[PDB]
Design a protein around this ligand. Structure first.
Ligand SMILES: *[C@@H]1O[C@H](CO)[C@@H](O)[C@H](O)[C@H]1NC(C)=O
Length: 221
């Protein structure tokens, strides 16, 4: 004993332990473990994110967004309320989302498609509670319930486009009319989109904790 640095399962009031077990898990599962219903988190591809601001007459659609950086996410807060087994934790993350942008200008019947890269620094949070459930036939497991995700962005995301796509947009009068009169709100849109990426990926990562809690007994508590 005297010098035991052996890790062992956490006591329910042992918060920095459970926080740390949450971190070890994230760090060793971001590649995915499909054998146990654990999804990849870095890289993670978001297939589609369509969006339409009316009647500023513009549709913007991000396609096949490859998101990287979540492997590096670091827990910044971790609450566990023993009465409800209610969990709340936040991580800090810097990600890059890389894919295709489609800009449609419906009143002109035009479309442009080029490469896009978004980068943000954020802090996202997840809140949910555990129930212990049957759960099949004598095996009892923790069951994480539906979560709420928060999103805070630090600074302003950088949005970056191919230079051919910049040129095409600069040279389009319908788009320029919008950028000139509504530049503000487009810039808004960019922060909404960062929070959408964050929401999407944090739901996956809680899916993963949820999937792990189903397999385990878990006197890994
Ligand atoms: C997160 O991104 C920001 C730059 O916007 C900076 O704090 C740092 O390079 C990143 N964090 C870490 C731990 O690298």
């Amino acid at each position: 004993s005297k010098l035991n640095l052996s890790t062992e399962p956490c006591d329910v009031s042992d918060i920095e332990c459970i926080s740390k077990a949450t971190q070890v898990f994230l760090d060793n599962t971001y590649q995915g473990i499909p054998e146990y219903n654990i999804k990849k988190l870095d890289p993670i591809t978001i297939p589609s994110l369509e969006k339409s601001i009316e009647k500023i007459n513009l549709n913007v659609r991000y396609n096949n967004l490859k998101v990287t950086g979540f492997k590096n996410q670091k827990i910044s807060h971790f609450t566990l309320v023993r009465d409800t087994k209610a969990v709340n934790f936040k991580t800090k993350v810097n990600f890059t989302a890389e894919g295709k942008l489609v800009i449609e200008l419906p009143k002109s019947s035009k479309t442009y498609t080029g490469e896009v890269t978004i980068e943000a620094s954020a802090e996202g949070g997840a809140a949910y509670s555990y129930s212990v459930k049957t759960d099949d036939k004598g095996v009892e497991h923790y069951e994480a319930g539906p979560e709420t995700v928060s999103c805070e962005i630090f600074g302003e995301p950088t949005l970056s486009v191919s230079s051919t796509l910049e040129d095409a947009l600069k040279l389009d009068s319908d788009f320029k009319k919008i950028f000139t009169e509504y530049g503000k709100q487009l810039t808004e849109g960019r922060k909404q989109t960062a929070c959408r990426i964050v929401e999407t990926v944090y739901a996956v990562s809680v899916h993963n904790i949820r999937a792990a809690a189903r397999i385990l007994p878990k006197s890994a508590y």
